[PDB]
Amino acid sequence: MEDFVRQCFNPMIVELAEKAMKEYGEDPKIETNKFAAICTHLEVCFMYSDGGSKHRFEIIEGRDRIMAWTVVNSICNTTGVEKPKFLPDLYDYKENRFIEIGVTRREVHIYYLEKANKIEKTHIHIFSFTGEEMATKADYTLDEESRARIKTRLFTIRQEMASRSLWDSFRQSERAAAEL
Ligand SMILES: COCCNC(=O)c1nc([C@@H]2CCCN2C(=O)COc2ccccc2)[nH]c(=O)c1O
Ligand SMILES: [Mn+2]
Ligand SMILES: [Mn+2]
């Protein structure tokens, strides 16, 4: 999986993922499913912002967690949006709401229900590796072409992993994390 990740993701994304794991005391060379999951989620967050104008989004994911909370506080202080209890992935400057992005190897609606349970003003948008998506109130934020690019990328990743016999382990690892 190490070779797959370094071959299919931008070096900057790989390095941010390595950094994140090291800060959490994890080895990218050992927890390789997590390594790929982090890369995939960060890439999706970048592709999501590309779906709006350059004025539309603040990307919160992939930044120093301590500093990210100060940006969240500045947004909440200036816009009057309620402060989220959990650090989100994006802020939408147009709709003035935070966004939580889910990327799951599980079923999109089960994942949505759990995320919603764990989260009230944050908008939730879930993507799968099988071309499915789910979003709060069926409000998908982006146009269909921007979302098609995301779904297509994730579908492509699943096929590439499957051809290297990595998909089944990657799939099961999200469920093992949920079981524990
Ligand atoms: C990880 O803790 C630092 C802040 N966590 C996030 O921001 C975040 N966490 C997760 C899931 C649920 C709780 C922990 N976790 C994972 O370890 C899965 O892998 C990821 C790790 C980081 C980013 C994306 C995926 N799911 C997301 O969608 C997400 O945005
Ligand atoms: Mn996040
Ligand atoms: Mn997320």
Side-chain angles (χ1 to χ4, degrees), residues 34 43 69 72 94 100 104 127 151 159 172:
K34 185 153 181 172
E43 193 181 59
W69 272 110
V72 171
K94 305 277 147 283
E100 175 56 32
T104 184
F127 298 93
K151 297 170 195 156
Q159 294 205 143
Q172 289 281 33

Side-chain angles (χ1 to χ4, degrees), residues 88-117 119 122-144 146-149:
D89 292 315
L90 304 304
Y91 183 72
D92 184 337
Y93 285 111
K94 305 277 147 283
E95 304 288 334
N96 285 283
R97 63 192 175 196
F98 291 98
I99 302 172
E100 175 56 32
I101 300 298
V103 181
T104 184
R105 298 92 81 190
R106 294 165 71 199
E107 310 92 324
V108 287
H109 47 11
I110 279 293
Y111 188 99
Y112 185 102
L113 187 65
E114 295 184 355
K115 203 77 121 167
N117 285 3
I119 292 179
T122 298
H123 209 75
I124 297 173
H125 198 146
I126 311 304
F127 298 93
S128 77
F129 295 76
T130 63
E132 305 167 60
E133 67 178 324
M134 186 156 172
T136 302
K137 295 278 182 191
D139 178 357
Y140 296 97
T141 300
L142 309 175
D143 64 4
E144 40 183 280
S146 296
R147 285 145 51 209
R149 174 191 177 196

Side-chain angles (χ1 to χ4, degrees), residues 50-64 66-81 83-84 86-115:
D50 281 331
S53 74
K54 289 296 166 84
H55 297 283
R56 174 144 195 179
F57 295 115
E58 186 81 24
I59 301 173
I60 303 176
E61 188 54 90
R63 297 159 71 171
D64 180 271
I66 302 189
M67 302 305 331
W69 272 110
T70 73
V71 176
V72 171
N73 272 117
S74 297
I75 290 168
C76 293
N77 288 336
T78 58
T79 69
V81 173
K83 174 140 185 270
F86 306 108
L87 191 73
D89 292 315
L90 304 304
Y91 183 72
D92 184 337
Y93 285 111
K94 305 277 147 283
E95 304 288 334
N96 285 283
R97 63 192 175 196
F98 291 98
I99 302 172
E100 175 56 32
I101 300 298
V103 181
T104 184
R105 298 92 81 190
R106 294 165 71 199
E107 310 92 324
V108 287
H109 47 11
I110 279 293
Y111 188 99
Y112 185 102
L113 187 65
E114 295 184 355
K115 203 77 121 167

Side-chain angles (χ1 to χ4, degrees), residues 39-52:
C39 288
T40 295
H41 178 267
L42 190 53
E43 193 181 59
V44 166
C45 287
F46 290 158
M47 290 185 283
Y48 205 96
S49 70
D50 281 331

Side-chain angles (χ1 to χ4, degrees), residues 136-144 146-171:
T136 302
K137 295 278 182 191
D139 178 357
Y140 296 97
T141 300
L142 309 175
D143 64 4
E144 40 183 280
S146 296
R147 285 145 51 209
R149 174 191 177 196
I150 291 165
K151 297 170 195 156
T152 289
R153 173 58 169 163
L154 296 169
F155 188 93
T156 291
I157 291 168
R158 172 168 69 82
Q159 294 205 143
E160 189 58 51
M161 288 181 170
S163 78
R164 304 173 187 230
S165 311
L166 311 162
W167 168 250
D168 298 302
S169 170
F170 186 61
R171 192 188 68 79

